[PDB]
Amino acid sequence: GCPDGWTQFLDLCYIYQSAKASWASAQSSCQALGGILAEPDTACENEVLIHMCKENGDAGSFGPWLGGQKVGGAWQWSSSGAAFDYLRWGPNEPNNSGGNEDCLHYNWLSWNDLRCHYQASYLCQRAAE
Numbered sequence: 001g002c003p004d005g006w007t008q009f010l011d012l013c014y015i016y017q018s019a020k021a022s023w024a025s026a027q028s029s030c031q032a033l034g035g036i037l038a039e040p041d042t043a044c045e046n047e048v049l050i051h052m053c054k055e056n057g058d059a060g061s062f063g064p065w066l067g068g069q070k071v072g073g074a075w076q077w078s079s080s081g082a083a084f085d086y087l088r089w090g091p092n093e094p095n096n097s098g099g100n101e102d103c104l105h106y107n108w109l110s111w112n113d114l115r116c117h118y119q120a121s122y123l124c125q126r127a128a129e
């Protein structure tokens with residue numbers, strides 16, 4: 001079971017929220033919905049979020065926040081501290097442009113590193129009931 005207006009995949013529920021929110025603000029928003037920024041650590045979870053991005057007309061540059069973060073030099077999922085294993089970086093990413101690209105988001109439907117105060121839409125996940 002997933003809540004109404006959310007998209008189901010295996011044991012997860014996702015939702016796209018149109019916003020102009022920093023990564024931190026987006027996290028706070030997902031937490032109020034009982035969830036977290038989406039952490040697509042499998043190829044198929046990414047395909048589902050990508051489909052949602054296309055559905056919401058957010059398939060180009062400065063696509064939505066995801067829950068990956070760069071702590072020091074290490075790319076990891078926020079909720080778990082897990083180092084990225086499966087990767088979905090876009091071509092020539094990550095590139096750390098301007099030196100402060102410490103948050104994960106979709107850029108042209110691929111992962112990119114972006115400055116965390118950039119204002120974007122966001123994707124949340126929660127456990128299915």
Ligand SMILES: CC(=O)N[C@@H]1[C@@H](O)[C@H](O[C@@H]2O[C@H](CO)[C@@H](O[C@@H]3O[C@H](CO[C@H]4O[C@H](CO)[C@@H](O)[C@H](O)[C@@H]4O[C@@H]4O[C@H](CO)[C@@H](O)[C@H](O)[C@H]4NC(C)=O)[C@@H](O)[C@H](O[C@H]4O[C@H](CO)[C@@H](O)[C@H](O)[C@@H]4O[C@@H]4O[C@H](CO)[C@@H](O)[C@H](O)[C@H]4NC(C)=O)[C@@H]3O)[C@H](O)[C@H]2NC(C)=O)[C@@H](CO)O[C@H]1O
Nearest residue numbers: 061062090091092093095097098101107108112113114115
């Ligand atoms: C109001 C006003 O006038 N404001 C302007 C303000 O717009 C402007 O900011 C610049 O805006 C432009 C236009 O949106 C930006 O250009 C696009 O950037 C996106 C975002 O990704 C880049 O930027 C972020 C940082 O913000 C960074 O995290 C990413 O890594 C990426 O940086 C770039 O990485 C490249 C490798 O990935 C490097 O080689 C670059 O040097 C590096 N850029 C920087 C700034 O360091 C980006 O996605 C866009 O790229 C698409 O479009 C171009 C042109 O068509 C293509 O050449 C690209 O290949 C890419 O196209 C897409 O590529 C996909 C695969 O990658 C394909 O799947 C897609 O189909 C294809 N899509 C299309 C439509 O062809 C742009 O490059 C830019 O970042 C802003 N800043 C700068 C400095 O340019 C500022 C700046 O002057 O001025 C204000 O006045």
Ligand SMILES: [Ca+2]
Nearest residue numbers: 095096112113
């Ligand atoms: Ca980048």
